[PDB]
Ligand binder design. Structure first.
Ligand code: MET
Ligand SMILES: O=P([O-])(O)O
Length: 511
């Protein structure tokens, strides 16, 4: 049972959780659930990044302490993930006591390696991005104020005696990493962008601040606070028992197998983060994957459902598993995507309610009121039965391949291809005709067709567990599958004839 450590980006709790956060949490949960069912030892970290000037300003604007905004908004972020049914092991917050020790530990490691030095910083700083920018990287507006060229965010002139990380010393050591291990950055398009960015030379990074005190204090220097990103990135270590490197959690889970992040914070994770770990003498994570953004088509406020970009609203409107499926199916993972009210409705009613819902319900109904509510004892299998079962048995292997990319959209395409095949099979065999017949060879065939249908929807249900936890559990309840037999190892064991089935009811309803 090999360990699998997966993390999400710990977002700033300065406002209301966006659709992008929910998209990330669902996507990461799907992989984390998939690995558990595939027999892995999974640690799954998520949470919030409560420090920084961005947080301190929003707290001062709302006239409350920074620590008060930290708890309140993190509680909101945590409840969203609870509503989204995220199976995280720990919801980390950078204000945690064990995180303070971990941030001070990695700092000491880097300083002892000789990568931290005191020097006066002079330059522009974006508070919205929590990011440093150079003179050329900024555009002087006709209004007078300065903005960051890339993001378009307002930048503030900063002149402080700060601590610097010798990032310029790791340029070629980072470029070798991308060449030797191309799997480090994903998708391929992101890696090439980072290669060209690092190829143009790297400048030293300021890693402490003095103008504010909302952040992790630098050891031996109370007047200095750690750069929010040095604080933020260390969470991935904290979530596995850092600074205790001898601990069971650290020796087993570190380095992380996958960092799940949005594409707007890729430089921090693929440039700064590995350089920090190289300096600290710690193993580098195996893969960082950046997903695209989800943008609304048309109007923000609907005339029937309300706010389209509100994650909580969509779950209340359409149902959790409906939203979970849509986001993972609609947009190819890694690319930017678009959605509207009709896109969700169409996908929910066609793919879930009809293609999967009705196939399951009709077959389970025929077993209930025509076959004594028990799995039919099948007869001899025909070429049609075998070919469909072969397409279903092949799923797990390719679904595993898609999930390792990660590419949840292709996995869902693969499963629906078989579900559609199961629907055409159901239409061709005509069980509703066969149940009316008096012939013994037609009655046994009716039992075989129903058994084959139940087996395909069982395999499908087992594989769809990471995507739709609640709905698939209720499907497997109706398919008489024991709770202690819902791992991917159970796919190889066919549904047992004579297994008692409870009264079937709709699980995927239309809108
Ligand atoms: C260590 S990942 C930090 C993510 C950052 N707080 C953001 O919201 O973009
Ligand atoms: O482009 P990749 O990194 O998803 O293979």
């Amino acid at each position: 049972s090999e360990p699998f450590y997966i993390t999400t980006a710990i977002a700033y709790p300065n406002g209301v959780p966006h659709i992008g956060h929910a998209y990330e949490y669902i996507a990461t949960d799907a992989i984390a659930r998939f690995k558990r069912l595939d027999g892995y030892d999974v640690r799954y970290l998520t949470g919030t990044d409560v420090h920084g000037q961005k947080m301190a300003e929003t707290a001062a604007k709302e006239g409350i302490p920074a620590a008060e905004l930290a708890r309140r908004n993190s509680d909101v972020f945590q409840r969203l993930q609870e509503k989204l049914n995220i199976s995280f092991d720990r919801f980390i917050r950078t204000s945690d006591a064990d995180h303070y020790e971990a941030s001070k530990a990695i700092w000491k490691r880097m300083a002892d390696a000789g990568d931290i030095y005191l020097d006066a910083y002079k330059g522009w700083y974006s508070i919205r991005d929590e990011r440093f920018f150079t003179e050329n990287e900024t555009t002087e507006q006709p209004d007078g104020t300065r903005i960051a060229t890339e993001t378009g965010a307002p930048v503030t002139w900063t002149e402080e005696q700060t601590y610097f990380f010798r990032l310029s010393a790791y340029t070629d050591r980072l470029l070798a990493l991308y060449e030797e291990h191309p799997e480090f950055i994903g998708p391929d398009a992101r890696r090439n962008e980072i290669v060209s960015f690092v190829s143009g030379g790297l400048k030293d990074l300021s890693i402490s601040r003095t103008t504010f005190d909302w952040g992790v204090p630098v050891p031996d220097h109370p007047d200095h606070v750690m750069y929010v990103w040095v604080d933020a990135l260390t969470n991935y270590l904290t979530g596995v028992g850092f600074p205790d490197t001898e601990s069971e959690s650290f020796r087993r889970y570190w380095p992380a197998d996958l960092h799940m992040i949005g594409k707007d914070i890729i430089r921090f994770h693929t440039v700064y983060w590995p350089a920090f770990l190289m300096s600290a003498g710690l193993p580098l994570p195996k893969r960082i994957f950046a997903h695209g953004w989800l943008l609304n088509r048309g109007e923000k406020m609907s005339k029937s459902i309300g706010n389209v970009v509100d994650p909580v609203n969509l779950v209340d409107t359409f149902g959790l598993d409906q939203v979970r499926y849509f986001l993972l199916r609609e947009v190819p993972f890694g690319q930017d995507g678009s959605y509207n009210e009709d896109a969700i409705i169409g996908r929910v009613n066609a793919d879930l309610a009809n293609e999967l819902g009705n196939l399951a319900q009709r077959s389970l109904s025929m077993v209930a009121k025509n076959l004594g509510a028990a799995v039919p004892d099948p007869g001899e299998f025909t070429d049609e039965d075998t070919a469909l079962l072969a397409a279903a048995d092949a799923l797990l292997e390719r679904v595993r391949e898609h999930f390792d990319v990660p590419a949840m959209h292709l996995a869902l395409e693969a499963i629906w291809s078989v579900l559609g095949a199961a629907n055409r099979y159901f239409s061709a065999q005509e069980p509703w005709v066969l149940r009316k017949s008096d012939a013994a060879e037609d009655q046994q065939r009716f039992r075989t067709v129903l058994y084959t249908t139940l087996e395909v929807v069982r395999i499908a249900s087992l594989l769809l567990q990471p995507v739709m936890p609640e709905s698939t559990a209720k499907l497997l309840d109706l398919l008489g599958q024991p709770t202690d037999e819902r791992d991917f190892s159970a796919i190889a064991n066919r549904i047992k004839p004579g297994t008692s089935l409870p009264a079937p009811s709709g699980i995927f309803p239309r809108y």
